[PDB]
mmCIF file of C-alpha atoms and ligand atoms in Angstrom:
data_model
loop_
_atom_site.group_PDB
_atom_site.id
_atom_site.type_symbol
_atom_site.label_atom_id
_atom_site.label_comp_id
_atom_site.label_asym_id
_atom_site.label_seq_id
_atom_site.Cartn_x
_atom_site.Cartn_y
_atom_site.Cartn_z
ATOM 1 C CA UNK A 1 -19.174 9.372 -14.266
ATOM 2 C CA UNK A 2 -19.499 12.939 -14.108
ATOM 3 C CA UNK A 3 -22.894 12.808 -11.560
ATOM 4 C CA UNK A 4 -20.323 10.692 -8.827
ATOM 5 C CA UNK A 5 -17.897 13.518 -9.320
ATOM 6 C CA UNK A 6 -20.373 16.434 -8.569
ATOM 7 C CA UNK A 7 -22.057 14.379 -5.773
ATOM 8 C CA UNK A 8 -18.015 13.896 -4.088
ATOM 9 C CA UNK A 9 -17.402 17.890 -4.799
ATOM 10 C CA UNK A 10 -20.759 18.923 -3.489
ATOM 11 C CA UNK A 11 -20.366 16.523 -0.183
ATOM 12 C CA UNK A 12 -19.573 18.047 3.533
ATOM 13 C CA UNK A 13 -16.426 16.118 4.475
ATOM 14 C CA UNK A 14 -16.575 14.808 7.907
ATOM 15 C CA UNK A 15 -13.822 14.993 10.773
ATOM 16 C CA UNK A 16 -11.259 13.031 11.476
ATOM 17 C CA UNK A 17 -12.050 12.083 14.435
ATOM 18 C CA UNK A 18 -15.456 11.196 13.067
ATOM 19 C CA UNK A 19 -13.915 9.258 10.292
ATOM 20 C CA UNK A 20 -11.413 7.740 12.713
ATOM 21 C CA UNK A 21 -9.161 7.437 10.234
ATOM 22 C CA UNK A 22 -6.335 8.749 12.858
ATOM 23 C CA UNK A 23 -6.580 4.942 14.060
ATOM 24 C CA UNK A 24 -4.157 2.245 13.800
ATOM 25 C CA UNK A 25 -7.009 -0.114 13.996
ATOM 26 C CA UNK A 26 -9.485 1.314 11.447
ATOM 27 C CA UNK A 27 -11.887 -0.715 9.296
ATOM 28 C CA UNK A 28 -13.487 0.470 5.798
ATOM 29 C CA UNK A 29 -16.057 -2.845 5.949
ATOM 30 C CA UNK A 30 -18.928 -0.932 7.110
ATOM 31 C CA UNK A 31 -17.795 2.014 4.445
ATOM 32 C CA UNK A 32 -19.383 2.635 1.627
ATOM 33 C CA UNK A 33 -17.165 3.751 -1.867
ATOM 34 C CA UNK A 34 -18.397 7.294 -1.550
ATOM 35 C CA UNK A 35 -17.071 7.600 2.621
ATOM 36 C CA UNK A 36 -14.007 5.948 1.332
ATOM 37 C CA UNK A 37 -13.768 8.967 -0.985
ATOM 38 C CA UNK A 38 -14.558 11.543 1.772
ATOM 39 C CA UNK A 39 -12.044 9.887 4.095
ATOM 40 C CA UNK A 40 -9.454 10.304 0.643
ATOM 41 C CA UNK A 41 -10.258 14.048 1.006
ATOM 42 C CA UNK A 42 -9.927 14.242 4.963
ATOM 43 C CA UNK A 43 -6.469 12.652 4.711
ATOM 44 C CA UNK A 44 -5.155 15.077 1.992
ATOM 45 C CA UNK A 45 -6.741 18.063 4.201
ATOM 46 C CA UNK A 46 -5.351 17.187 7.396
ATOM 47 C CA UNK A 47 -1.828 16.850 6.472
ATOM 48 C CA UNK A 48 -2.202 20.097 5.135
ATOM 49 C CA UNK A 49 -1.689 19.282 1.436
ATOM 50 C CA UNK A 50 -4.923 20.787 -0.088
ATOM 51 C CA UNK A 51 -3.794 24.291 1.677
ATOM 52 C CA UNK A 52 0.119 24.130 1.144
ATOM 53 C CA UNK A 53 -0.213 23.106 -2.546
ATOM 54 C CA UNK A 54 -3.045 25.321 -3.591
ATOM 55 C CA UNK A 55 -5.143 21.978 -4.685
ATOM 56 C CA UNK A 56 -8.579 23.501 -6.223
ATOM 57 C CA UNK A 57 -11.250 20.683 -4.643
ATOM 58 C CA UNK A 58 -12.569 19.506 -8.063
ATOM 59 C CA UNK A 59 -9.678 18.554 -9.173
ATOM 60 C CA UNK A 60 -8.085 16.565 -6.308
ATOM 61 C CA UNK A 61 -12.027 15.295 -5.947
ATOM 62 C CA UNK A 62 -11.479 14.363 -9.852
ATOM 63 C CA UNK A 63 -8.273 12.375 -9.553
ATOM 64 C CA UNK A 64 -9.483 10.402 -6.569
ATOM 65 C CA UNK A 65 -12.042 9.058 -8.348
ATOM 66 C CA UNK A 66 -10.125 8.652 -11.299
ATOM 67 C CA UNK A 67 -7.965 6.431 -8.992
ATOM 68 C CA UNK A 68 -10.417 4.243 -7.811
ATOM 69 C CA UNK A 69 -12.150 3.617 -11.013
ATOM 70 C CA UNK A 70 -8.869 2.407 -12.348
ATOM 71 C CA UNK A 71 -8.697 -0.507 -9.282
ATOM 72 C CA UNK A 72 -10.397 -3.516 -11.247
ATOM 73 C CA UNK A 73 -13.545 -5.103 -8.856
ATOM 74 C CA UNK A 74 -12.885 -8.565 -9.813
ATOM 75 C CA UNK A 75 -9.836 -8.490 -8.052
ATOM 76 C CA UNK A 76 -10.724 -10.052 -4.381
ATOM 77 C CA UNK A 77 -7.570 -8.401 -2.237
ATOM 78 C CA UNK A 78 -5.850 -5.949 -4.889
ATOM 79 C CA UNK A 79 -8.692 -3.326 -5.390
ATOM 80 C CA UNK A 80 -9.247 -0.038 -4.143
ATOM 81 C CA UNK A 81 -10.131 -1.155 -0.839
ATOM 82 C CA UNK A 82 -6.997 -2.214 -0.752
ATOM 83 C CA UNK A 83 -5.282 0.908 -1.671
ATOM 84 C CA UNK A 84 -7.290 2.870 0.600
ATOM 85 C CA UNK A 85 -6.751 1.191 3.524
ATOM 86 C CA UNK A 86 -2.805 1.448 2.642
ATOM 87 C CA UNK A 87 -3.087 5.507 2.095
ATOM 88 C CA UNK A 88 -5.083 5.101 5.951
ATOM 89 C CA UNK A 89 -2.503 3.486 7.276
ATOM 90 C CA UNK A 90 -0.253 5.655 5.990
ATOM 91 C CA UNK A 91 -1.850 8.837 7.135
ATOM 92 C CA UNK A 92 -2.543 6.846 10.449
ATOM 93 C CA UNK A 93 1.353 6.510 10.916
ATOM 94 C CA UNK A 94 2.044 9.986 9.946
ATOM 95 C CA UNK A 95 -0.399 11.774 12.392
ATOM 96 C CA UNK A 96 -0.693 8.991 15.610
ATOM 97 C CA UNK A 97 2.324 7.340 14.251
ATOM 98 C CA UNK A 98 4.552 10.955 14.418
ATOM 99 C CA UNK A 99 6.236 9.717 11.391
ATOM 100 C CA UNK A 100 4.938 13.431 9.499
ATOM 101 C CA UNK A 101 7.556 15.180 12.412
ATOM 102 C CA UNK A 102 10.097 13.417 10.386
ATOM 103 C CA UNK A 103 9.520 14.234 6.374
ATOM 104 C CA UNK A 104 9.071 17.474 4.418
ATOM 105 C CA UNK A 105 5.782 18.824 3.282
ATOM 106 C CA UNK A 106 6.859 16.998 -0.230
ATOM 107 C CA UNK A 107 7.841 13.485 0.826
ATOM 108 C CA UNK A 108 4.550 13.176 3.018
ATOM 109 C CA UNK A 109 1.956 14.972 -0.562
ATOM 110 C CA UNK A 110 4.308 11.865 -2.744
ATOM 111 C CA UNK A 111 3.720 9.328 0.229
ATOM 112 C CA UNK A 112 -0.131 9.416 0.286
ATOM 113 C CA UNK A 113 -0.218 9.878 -3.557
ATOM 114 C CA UNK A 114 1.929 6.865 -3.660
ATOM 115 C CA UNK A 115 -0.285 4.563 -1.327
ATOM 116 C CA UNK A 116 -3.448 5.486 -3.264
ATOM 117 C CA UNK A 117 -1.836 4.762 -6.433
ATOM 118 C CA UNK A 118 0.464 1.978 -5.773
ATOM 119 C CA UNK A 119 -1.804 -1.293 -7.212
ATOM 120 C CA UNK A 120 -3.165 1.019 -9.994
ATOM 121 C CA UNK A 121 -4.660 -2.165 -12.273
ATOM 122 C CA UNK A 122 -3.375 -4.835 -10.288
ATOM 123 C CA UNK A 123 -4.841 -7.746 -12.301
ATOM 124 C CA UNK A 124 -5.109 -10.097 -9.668
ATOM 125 C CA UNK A 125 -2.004 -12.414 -10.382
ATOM 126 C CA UNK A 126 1.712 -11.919 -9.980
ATOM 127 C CA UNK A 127 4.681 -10.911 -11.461
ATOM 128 C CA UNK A 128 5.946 -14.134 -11.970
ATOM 129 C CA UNK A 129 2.795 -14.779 -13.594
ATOM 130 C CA UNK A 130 3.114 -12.257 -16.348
ATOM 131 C CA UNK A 131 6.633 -13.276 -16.775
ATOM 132 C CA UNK A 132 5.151 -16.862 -17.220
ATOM 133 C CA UNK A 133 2.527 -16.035 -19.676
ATOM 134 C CA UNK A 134 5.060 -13.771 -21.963
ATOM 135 C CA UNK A 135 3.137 -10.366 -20.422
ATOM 136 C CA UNK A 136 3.440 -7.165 -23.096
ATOM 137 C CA UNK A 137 4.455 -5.171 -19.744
ATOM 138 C CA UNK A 138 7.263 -8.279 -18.425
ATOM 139 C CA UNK A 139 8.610 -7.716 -21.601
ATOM 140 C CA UNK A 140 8.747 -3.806 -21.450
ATOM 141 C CA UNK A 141 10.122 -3.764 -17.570
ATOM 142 C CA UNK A 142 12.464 -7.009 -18.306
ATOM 143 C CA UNK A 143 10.845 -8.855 -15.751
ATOM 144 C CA UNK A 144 11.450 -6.656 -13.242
ATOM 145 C CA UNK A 145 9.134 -5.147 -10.765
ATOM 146 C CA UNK A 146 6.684 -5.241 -14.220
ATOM 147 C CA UNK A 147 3.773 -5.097 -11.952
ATOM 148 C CA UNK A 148 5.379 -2.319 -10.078
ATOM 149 C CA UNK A 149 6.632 0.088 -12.574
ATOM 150 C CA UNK A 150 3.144 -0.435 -14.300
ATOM 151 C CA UNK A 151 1.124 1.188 -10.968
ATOM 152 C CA UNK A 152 3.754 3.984 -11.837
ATOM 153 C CA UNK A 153 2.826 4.457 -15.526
ATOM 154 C CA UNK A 154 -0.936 3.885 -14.781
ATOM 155 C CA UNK A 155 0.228 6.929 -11.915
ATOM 156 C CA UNK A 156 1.590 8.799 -14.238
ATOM 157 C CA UNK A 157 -1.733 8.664 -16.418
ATOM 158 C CA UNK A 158 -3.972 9.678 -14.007
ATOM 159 C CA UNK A 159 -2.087 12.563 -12.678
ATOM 160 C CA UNK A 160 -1.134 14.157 -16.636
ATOM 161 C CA UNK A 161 -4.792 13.493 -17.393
ATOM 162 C CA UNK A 162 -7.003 17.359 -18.152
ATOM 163 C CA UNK A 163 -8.979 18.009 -14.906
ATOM 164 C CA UNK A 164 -6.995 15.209 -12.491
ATOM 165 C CA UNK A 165 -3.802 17.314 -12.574
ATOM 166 C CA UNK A 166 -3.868 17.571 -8.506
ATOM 167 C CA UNK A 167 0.508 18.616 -9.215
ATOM 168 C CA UNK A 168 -0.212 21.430 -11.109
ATOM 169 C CA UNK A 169 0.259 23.757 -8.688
ATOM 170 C CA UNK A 170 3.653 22.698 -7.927
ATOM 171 C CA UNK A 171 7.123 24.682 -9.086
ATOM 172 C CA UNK A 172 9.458 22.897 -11.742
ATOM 173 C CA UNK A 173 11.573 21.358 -8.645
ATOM 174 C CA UNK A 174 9.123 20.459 -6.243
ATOM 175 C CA UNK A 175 7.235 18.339 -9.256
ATOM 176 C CA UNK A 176 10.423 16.887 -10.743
ATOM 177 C CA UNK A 177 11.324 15.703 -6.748
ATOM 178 C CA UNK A 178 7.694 14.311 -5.898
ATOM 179 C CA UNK A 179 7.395 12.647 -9.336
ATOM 180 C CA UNK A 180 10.828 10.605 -8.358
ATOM 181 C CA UNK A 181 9.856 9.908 -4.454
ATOM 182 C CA UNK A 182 6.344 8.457 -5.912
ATOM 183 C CA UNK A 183 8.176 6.180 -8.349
ATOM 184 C CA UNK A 184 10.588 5.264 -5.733
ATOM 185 C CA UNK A 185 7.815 4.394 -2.777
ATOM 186 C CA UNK A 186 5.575 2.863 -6.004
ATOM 187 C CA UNK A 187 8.904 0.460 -7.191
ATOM 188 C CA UNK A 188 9.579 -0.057 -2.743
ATOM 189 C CA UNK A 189 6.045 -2.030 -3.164
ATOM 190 C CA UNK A 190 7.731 -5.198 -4.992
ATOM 191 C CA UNK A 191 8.635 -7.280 -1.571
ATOM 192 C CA UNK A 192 11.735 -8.458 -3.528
ATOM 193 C CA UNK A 193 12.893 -4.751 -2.890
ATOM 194 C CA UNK A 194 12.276 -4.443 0.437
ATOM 195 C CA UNK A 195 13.909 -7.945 1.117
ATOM 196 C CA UNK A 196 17.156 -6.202 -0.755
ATOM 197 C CA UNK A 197 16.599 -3.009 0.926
ATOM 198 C CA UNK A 198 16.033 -3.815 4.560
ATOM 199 C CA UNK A 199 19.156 -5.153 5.795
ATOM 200 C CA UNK A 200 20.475 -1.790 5.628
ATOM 201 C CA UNK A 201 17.494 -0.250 7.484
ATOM 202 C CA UNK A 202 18.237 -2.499 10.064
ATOM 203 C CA UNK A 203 21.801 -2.369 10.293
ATOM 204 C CA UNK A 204 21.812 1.946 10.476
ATOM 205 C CA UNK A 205 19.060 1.406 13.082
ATOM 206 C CA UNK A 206 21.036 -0.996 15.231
ATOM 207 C CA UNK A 207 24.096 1.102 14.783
ATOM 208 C CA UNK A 208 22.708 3.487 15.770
ATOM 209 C CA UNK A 209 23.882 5.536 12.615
ATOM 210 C CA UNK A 210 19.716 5.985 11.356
ATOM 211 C CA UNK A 211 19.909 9.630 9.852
ATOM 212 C CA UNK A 212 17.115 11.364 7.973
ATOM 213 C CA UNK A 213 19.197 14.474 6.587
ATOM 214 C CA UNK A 214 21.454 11.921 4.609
ATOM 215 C CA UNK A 215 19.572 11.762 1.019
ATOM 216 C CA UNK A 216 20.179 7.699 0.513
ATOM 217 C CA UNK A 217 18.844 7.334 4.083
ATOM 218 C CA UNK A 218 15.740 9.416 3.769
ATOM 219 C CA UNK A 219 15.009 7.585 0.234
ATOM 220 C CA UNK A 220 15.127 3.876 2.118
ATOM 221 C CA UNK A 221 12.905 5.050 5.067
ATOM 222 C CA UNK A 222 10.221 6.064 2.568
ATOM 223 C CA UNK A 223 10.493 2.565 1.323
ATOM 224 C CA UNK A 224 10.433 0.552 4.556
ATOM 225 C CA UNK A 225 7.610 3.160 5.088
ATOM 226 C CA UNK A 226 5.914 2.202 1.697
ATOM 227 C CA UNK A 227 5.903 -1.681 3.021
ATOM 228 C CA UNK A 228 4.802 -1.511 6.614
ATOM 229 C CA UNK A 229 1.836 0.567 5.009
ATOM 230 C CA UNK A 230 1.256 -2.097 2.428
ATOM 231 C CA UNK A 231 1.315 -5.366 4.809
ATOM 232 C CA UNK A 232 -0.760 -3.800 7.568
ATOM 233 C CA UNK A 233 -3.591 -5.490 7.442
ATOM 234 C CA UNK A 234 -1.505 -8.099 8.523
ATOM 235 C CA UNK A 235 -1.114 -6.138 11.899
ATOM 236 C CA UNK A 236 -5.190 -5.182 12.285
ATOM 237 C CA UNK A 237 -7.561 -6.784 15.308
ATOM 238 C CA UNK A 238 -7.867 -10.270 14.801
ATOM 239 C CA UNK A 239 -11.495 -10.481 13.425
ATOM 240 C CA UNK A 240 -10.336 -7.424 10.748
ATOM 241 C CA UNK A 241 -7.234 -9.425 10.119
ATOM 242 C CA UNK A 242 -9.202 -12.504 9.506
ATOM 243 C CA UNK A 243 -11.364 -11.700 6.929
ATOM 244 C CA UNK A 244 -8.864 -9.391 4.943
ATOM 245 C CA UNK A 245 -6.293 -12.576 5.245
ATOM 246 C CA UNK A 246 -9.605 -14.317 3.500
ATOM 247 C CA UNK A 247 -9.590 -11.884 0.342
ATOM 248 C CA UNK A 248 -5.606 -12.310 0.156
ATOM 249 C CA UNK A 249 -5.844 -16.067 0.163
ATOM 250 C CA UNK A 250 -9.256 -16.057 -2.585
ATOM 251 C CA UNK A 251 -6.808 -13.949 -4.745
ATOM 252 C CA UNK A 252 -3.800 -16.361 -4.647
ATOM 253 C CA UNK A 253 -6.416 -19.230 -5.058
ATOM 254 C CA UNK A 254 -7.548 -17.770 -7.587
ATOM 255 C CA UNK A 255 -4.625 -16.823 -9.745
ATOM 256 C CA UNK A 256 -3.826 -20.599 -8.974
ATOM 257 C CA UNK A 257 -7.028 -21.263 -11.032
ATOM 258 C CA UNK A 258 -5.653 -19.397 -13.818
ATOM 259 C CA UNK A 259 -2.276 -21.196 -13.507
ATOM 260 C CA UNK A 260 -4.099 -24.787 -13.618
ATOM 261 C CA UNK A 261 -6.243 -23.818 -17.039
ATOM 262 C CA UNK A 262 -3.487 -21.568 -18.619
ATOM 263 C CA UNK A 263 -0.510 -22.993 -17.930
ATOM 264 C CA UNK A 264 -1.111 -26.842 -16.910
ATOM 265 C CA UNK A 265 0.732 -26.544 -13.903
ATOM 266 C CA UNK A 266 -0.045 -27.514 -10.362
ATOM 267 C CA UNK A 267 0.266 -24.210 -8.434
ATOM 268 C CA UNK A 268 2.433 -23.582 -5.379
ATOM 269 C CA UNK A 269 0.979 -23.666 -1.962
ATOM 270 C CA UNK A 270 0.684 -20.405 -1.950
ATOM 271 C CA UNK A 271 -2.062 -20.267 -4.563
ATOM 272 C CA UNK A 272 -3.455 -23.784 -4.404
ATOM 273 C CA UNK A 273 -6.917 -23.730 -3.125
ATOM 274 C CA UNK A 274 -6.209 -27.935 -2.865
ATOM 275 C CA UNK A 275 -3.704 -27.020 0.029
ATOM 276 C CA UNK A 276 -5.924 -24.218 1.827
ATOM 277 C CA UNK A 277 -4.896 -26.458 4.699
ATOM 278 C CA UNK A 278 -1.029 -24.434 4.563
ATOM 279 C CA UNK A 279 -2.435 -20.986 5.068
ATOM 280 C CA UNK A 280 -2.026 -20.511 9.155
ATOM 281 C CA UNK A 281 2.104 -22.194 8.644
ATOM 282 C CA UNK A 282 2.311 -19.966 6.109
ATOM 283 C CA UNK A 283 1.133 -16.724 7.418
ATOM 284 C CA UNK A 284 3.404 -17.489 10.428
ATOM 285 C CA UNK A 285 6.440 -18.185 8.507
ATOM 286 C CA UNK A 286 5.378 -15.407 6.658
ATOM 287 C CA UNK A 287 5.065 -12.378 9.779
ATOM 288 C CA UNK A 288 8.100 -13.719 11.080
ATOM 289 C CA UNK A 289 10.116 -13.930 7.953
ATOM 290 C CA UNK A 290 9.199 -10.472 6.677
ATOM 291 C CA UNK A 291 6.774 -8.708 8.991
ATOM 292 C CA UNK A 292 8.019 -8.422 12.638
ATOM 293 C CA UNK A 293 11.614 -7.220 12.120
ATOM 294 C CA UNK A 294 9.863 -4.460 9.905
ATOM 295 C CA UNK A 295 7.092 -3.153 12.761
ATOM 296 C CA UNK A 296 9.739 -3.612 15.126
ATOM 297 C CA UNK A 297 12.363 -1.339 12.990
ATOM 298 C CA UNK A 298 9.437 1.156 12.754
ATOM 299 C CA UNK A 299 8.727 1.479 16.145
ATOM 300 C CA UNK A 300 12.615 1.375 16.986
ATOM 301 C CA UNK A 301 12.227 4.954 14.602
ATOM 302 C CA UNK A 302 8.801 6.450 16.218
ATOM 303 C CA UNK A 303 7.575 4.793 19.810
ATOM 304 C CA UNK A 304 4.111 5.829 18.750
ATOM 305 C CA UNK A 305 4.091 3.480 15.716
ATOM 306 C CA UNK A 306 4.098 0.706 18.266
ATOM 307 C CA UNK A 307 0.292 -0.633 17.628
ATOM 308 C CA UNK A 308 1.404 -2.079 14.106
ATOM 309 C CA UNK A 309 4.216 -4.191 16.087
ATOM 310 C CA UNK A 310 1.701 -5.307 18.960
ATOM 311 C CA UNK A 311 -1.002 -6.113 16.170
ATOM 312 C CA UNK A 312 1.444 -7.723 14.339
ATOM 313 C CA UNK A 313 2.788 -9.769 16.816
ATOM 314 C CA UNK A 314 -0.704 -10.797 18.509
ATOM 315 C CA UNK A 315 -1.477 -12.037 15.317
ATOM 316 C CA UNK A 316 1.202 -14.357 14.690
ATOM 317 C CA UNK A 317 0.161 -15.935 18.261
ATOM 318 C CA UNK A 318 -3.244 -16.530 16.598
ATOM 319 C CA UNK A 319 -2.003 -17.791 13.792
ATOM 320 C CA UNK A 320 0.367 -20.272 15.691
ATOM 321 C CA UNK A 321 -2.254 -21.097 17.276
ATOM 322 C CA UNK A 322 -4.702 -22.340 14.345
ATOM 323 C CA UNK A 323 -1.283 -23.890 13.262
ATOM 324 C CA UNK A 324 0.038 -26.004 15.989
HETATM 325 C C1 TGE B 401 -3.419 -15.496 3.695
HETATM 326 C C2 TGE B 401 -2.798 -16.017 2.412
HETATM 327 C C3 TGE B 401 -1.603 -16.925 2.704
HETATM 328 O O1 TGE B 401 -0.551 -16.078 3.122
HETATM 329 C C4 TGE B 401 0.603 -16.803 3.481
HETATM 330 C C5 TGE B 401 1.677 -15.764 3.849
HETATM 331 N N1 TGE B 401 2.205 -15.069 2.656
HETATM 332 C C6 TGE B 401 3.207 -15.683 1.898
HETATM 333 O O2 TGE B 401 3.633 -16.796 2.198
HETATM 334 C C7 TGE B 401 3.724 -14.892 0.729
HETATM 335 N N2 TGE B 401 4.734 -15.503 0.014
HETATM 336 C C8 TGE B 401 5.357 -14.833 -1.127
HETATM 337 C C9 TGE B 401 6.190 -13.607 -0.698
HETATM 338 N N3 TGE B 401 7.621 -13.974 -0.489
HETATM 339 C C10 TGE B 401 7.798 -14.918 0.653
HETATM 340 C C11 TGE B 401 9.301 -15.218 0.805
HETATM 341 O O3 TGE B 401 10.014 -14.036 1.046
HETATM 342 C C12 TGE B 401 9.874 -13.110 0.003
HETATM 343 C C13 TGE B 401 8.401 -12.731 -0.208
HETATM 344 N N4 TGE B 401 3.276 -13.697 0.371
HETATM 345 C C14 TGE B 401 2.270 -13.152 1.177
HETATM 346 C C15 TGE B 401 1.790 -11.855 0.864
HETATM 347 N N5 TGE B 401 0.868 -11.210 1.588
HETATM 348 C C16 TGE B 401 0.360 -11.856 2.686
HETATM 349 C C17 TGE B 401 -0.634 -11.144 3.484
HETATM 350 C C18 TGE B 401 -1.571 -11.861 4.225
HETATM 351 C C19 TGE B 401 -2.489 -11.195 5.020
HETATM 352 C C20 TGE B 401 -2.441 -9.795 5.027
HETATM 353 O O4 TGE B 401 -3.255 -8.999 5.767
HETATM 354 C C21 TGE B 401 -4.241 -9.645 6.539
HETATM 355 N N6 TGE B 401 -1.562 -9.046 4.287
HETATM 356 C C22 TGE B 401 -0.686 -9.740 3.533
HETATM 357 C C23 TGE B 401 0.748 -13.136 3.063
HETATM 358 C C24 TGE B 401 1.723 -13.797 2.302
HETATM 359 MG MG1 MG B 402 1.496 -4.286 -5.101
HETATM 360 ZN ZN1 ZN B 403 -0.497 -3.113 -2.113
#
């Protein structure tokens, strides 16, 4: 709609500070779409992107709109919610986090564009799913990272589309580089990658080897980056934590629905609302499996990124807790 657009353009967009969007521990729930919007602009103003890359307000106001509207609402954890609060965390890390002292002016503009945009039409189910029901787009990525490289295409959309061209002001080289760091941190979003990935994060940090001017080094930093943004709801206070975990857990259910009628299978755990009684096992498994070594890697890299470990960590104990 045109009348959201010139209502977003027209609005005053508050602090930071008043936002408080410079917290590890922010909440959108009492947010409504059009502050998530404002806080969009705030976090593409304070890291200086609107000034260094000579973004005209319309247009970046244009394409964050144009992002959200392509987040499907009957999606329960997926959504644009979801990819907001992964862009905040993101800009959280940067600024509180001092993970911005670390990147170029480019890798931090491809970063946030690459949080907002990283679900872009997440249908709610999968990859294995689409693999399982013979997807158009499993078939086009040969079943790899399909739901992945399709946030990248649906990416790619928005930002070639007339008026949401927030890149136009770019040279030839800086496009050509940000276009290939958003792909990358978009593709880093498939967990299977980041399992891959990671033991080599780890081993350069133990090593003490962990070196940001080497190119392959600075390209697998952006994305362990990309996944410690994307899980960190996981690492939120408990009663945030909670009710996000709820959305995640309505989403599995309820591709597990779709699994039962379509494919006349009994789902796995994971998404079988029958065994609801696995989630707290499961999310502990899960945080120690995946999550801790990560926010514990991140703050081994910046000290100040340490409230996604302690979050993390005080909510396995929770978790165990419900468990056990
Ligand atoms: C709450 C739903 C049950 O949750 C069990 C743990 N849980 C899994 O068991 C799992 N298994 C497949 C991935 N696999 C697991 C094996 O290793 C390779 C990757 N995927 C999950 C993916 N996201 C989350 C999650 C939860 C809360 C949250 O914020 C609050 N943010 C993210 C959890 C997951
Ligand atoms: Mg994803
Ligand atoms: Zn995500």
């Amino acid at each position: 709609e045109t009348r959201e657009l010139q209502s977003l353009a027209a609005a005053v967009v508050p602090s930071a500070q008043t936002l408080k969007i410079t917290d590890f521990s922010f909440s959108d729930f009492e947010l409504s779409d059009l502050e998530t919007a404002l806080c969009t602009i705030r976090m593409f103003t304070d890291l200086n992107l609107v000034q260094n890359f000579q973004m005209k307000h319309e247009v970046l106001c244009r394409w964050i709109l144009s992002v959200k509207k392509n987040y499907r609402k009957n999606v329960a954890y997926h959504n644009w919610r979801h990819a907001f609060n992964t862009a905040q965390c993101m800009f959280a890390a940067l600024k509180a986090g001092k993970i911005q002292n670390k990147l170029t002016d480019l890798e931090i503009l491809a970063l946030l564009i690459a949080a907002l945009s990283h679900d872009l039409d997440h249908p709610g189910v999968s990859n294995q799913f689409l693999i399982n029901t013979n997807s158009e787009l499993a078939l086009m990525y040969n079943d790899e990272s399909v739901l992945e490289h399709h946030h990248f295409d649906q990416c790619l959309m928005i930002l070639n589309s007339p008026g949401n061209q927030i890149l136009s002001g770019l040279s030839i080289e800086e496009y050509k580089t940000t276009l290939k760091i958003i792909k990358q941190a978009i593709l880093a979003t498939d967990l299977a990658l980041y399992i891959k990935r990671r033991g080599e994060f780890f081993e350069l940090i133990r090593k003490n080897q962990f070196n940001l001017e080497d190119p392959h080094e600075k390209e697998l930093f952006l994305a362990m980056l990309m996944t410690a943004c994307d899980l960190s709801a996981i690492t939120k206070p408990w009663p945030i934590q909670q009710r996000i975990a709820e959305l995640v857990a309505t989403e599995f259910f309820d591709q597990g629905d779709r699994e039962r009628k379509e494919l006349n299978i009994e789902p796995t755990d994971l998404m079988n609302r029958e065994k609801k009684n696995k989630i707290p096992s499961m999310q502990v498994g899960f945080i120690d499996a995946i999550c801790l070594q990560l926010y514990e890697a991140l703050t081994h890299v910046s000290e100040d990124c340490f409230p996604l470990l302690d979050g993390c960590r005080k909510n396995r104990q929770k978790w165990q807790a419900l468990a056990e």
